[PDB]
């Protein structure tokens, strides 16, 4: 229920799902067994500052216990460093499809072709469950971006998520994005 954040020991040539390529919180088999993890299922991350984000767990072999090696970008978006402690939870609640997601750019204001960036974000970030106020990263032709999500709306009807057993949402090829 509590693990030691490291940095990912990345050498994944055959790193499986040519999809999970974005979520990717590595783990260790016995660690999975301890925290009731199971492949391809989402997992919730809570920091000692009150920030949260979820990710598709994956048990890549070659790691020791308690070392849930995140990705650098998770380490930023939740504000952790290589050696701190973090709370891992196996997601249990519902998971639906998310229609409306609104999000604003960072200070790279060049007014890129709107739908184009939409196409890239979608074709790059399937399955990344989101929350209000996180950051995404879609290197659309080398040129990086950094987006801040404000509000999201899911087909079930609610509109935005702090505990595990409750709603979430994710992006599929039929999601609408607003840029404000």
């Amino acid at each position: 229920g509590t693990l030691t954040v490291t940095n990912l020991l990345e050498k994944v040539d055959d790193k499986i799902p040519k999809t999970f390529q974005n979520s990717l919180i590595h783990l260790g088999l016995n660690t999975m067994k301890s925290a009731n993890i199971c492949i391809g299922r989402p997992v919730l991350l809570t920091s000692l500052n009150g920030k949260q984000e979820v990710y598709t767990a994956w048990p890549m072999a070659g790691f020791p216990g308690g070392k849930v090696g995140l990705s650098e970008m998770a380490q930023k978006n939740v504000g952790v460093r290589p050696g701190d402690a973090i709370q891992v939870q196996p997601l249990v609640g519902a998971v639906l499809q998310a229609e409306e997601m609104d999000v604003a750019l960072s200070d790279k204001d060049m007014e890129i072709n709107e739908e184009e960036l939409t196409g890239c974000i979608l074709r790059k970030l399937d399955g990344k469950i989101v929350l209000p106020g996180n950051f995404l990263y879609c290197t659309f032709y080398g040129r990086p971006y950094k987006l801040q999500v404000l509000r999201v709306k899911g087909a079930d009807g609610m509109i935005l998520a702090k505990c595990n057993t409750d709603t979430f949402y994710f992006i599929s090829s039929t999601t609408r994005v607003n840029f404000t």
Partner: protein, 196 residues
């Protein structure tokens, strides 16, 4: 018990892996042949846009058009029979994997009265589920069949006499492959690797 279904899946998957490899090598061989066939058809399409009696040098010749056309078509016929052989190998892999998947499903439907659906939904630490594995097998058989049956009704609409269609073939062929989920076989394999 449920161990029977588990064994069935452990047995079925490696077949799917090797068969995918065979499929892949087959299509790989298939590509350049079809390129050459496009080129041949183009070269032929050219050699009927002349009169072969209204050019000075060629005039001192009884008949070229006929003999050259005959030779070109012989070459085309040989390359197209090579494509036919490849298609036969494709058919083999389709039928084999379909039979196997059907065996798996039949085992399950045979046993699914003592294994409560809930026991079908226990995603363990190193195994997605018997449920999702049956689902993926079903999806992989559908993928194979649709790809094969869509490649045939393309490859068997070739008629010397529509020399635009042939010359366009390679693009349509390649496109037939860039609309599935290559990740289908690749990720299914990976995703279930730890199950062995």
């Amino acid at each position: 018990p449920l161990l029977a279904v588990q064994e069935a899946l452990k047995k079925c998957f490696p077949v799917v892996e090797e068969q995918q490899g065979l499929w892949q090598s087959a299509l790989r061989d298939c590509q350049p042949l079809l390129s050459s066939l496009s080129n041949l058809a183009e070269q032929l399409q050219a050699a009927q846009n002349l009169r072969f009696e209204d050019v000075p040098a060629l005039r001192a010749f009884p008949d070229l058009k006929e003999r050259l056309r005959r030779k070109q078509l012989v070459a085309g016929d040989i390359v197209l029979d090579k494509l036919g052989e490849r298609l036969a190998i494709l058919l083999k892999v389709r039928d084999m994997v379909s039979s196997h998947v059907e065996r798996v499903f039949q085992i399950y439907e045979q046993h699914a009265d003592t294994v409560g659906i809930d026991a079908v939904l226990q995603p363990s630490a190193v195994s997605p589920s018997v449920a999702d594995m049956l689902e993926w097998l079903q999806d992989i058989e559908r993928h194979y069949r649709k790809s094969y049956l869509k490649r045939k009704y393309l490859l068997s609409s070739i008629q010397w006499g529509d020399l635009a269609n042939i010359q366009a073939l390679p693009k349509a062929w390649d496109r037939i492959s860039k609309d599935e989920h290559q990740d289908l076989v690749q990720d299914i394999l990976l995703n279930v690797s730890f199950f062995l």
